[PDB]
């Protein structure tokens, strides 16, 4: 994976969890970040785009940011339905194509 994500995390309901991703000047440094959510046994879906916008239908408990070569997805009030794998995506100007993180699992206690 060209992007590197923060390690998988376990947290209790109502906790704040922040997943981070780290890239390079040519990808996250120059292009906006999308977040993809894959719930257990479901297809991956778009969760956030343009760094900080919610995809249609997505809970406003999610927020995103981008600074330099880093980006982050915050889940403010963690709930059972958030148990999932989260992937970062962006464009890479040097590879002329989409690049991805290796995913971060959120497990809720």
């Amino acid at each position: 994976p060209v992007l590197t994500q923060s390690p998988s995390v376990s947290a209790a309901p109502r906790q704040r969890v922040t997943i981070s991703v780290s890239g390079s000047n040519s990808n996250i440094g120059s292009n906006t970040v999308n977040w993809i959510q894959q719930l257990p046994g479901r297809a991956p879906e778009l969760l956030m785009y343009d760094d900080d916008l919610l995809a249609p239908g997505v809970s406003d408990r999610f927020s995103g940011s981008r600074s330099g070569t880093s980006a982050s997805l915050t889940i403010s009030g963690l709930q059972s339905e958030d148990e999932a794998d989260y992937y970062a995506a962006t464009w890479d100007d040097s590879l002329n194509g989409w690049v991805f993180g290796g995913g971060t699992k959120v497990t809720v206690l």
């Binding site: 999308n34 778009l46 343009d50 995506a89 989409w98 991805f100």
Partner: protein, 83 residues
């Protein structure tokens, strides 16, 4: 702003990611290529029963570099024509 352009680009990245996961389901090796053997396993998970030569022929129709196996970009061309 360019609201619809940004959203449509994001959905393109989600479509590529979805193909990456599909590729991974073919590439049960994880070696980054789809062989006749792996393609055959997927085709028979569907109802189908191709010969090894027919599987090679499916490969050859998208084999751009000519190494006799399918890599991710060639897989994208194969899915383009199907979809």
């Amino acid at each position: 702003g360019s609201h619809m352009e940004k959203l449509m680009k994001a959905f393109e990245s989600l479509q590529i990611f979805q193909f990456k996961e599909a590729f991974s389901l073919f590439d049960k090796d994880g070696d980054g290529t789809i062989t006749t053997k792996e393609l055959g396993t997927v085709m028979r998970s569907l109802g189908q029963n191709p010969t090894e030569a027919e599987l090679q022929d499916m490969i050859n129709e998208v084999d751009a570099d000519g190494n006799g196996t399918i890599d991710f970009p060639e897989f994208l061309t194969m899915m383009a024509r199907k979809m």
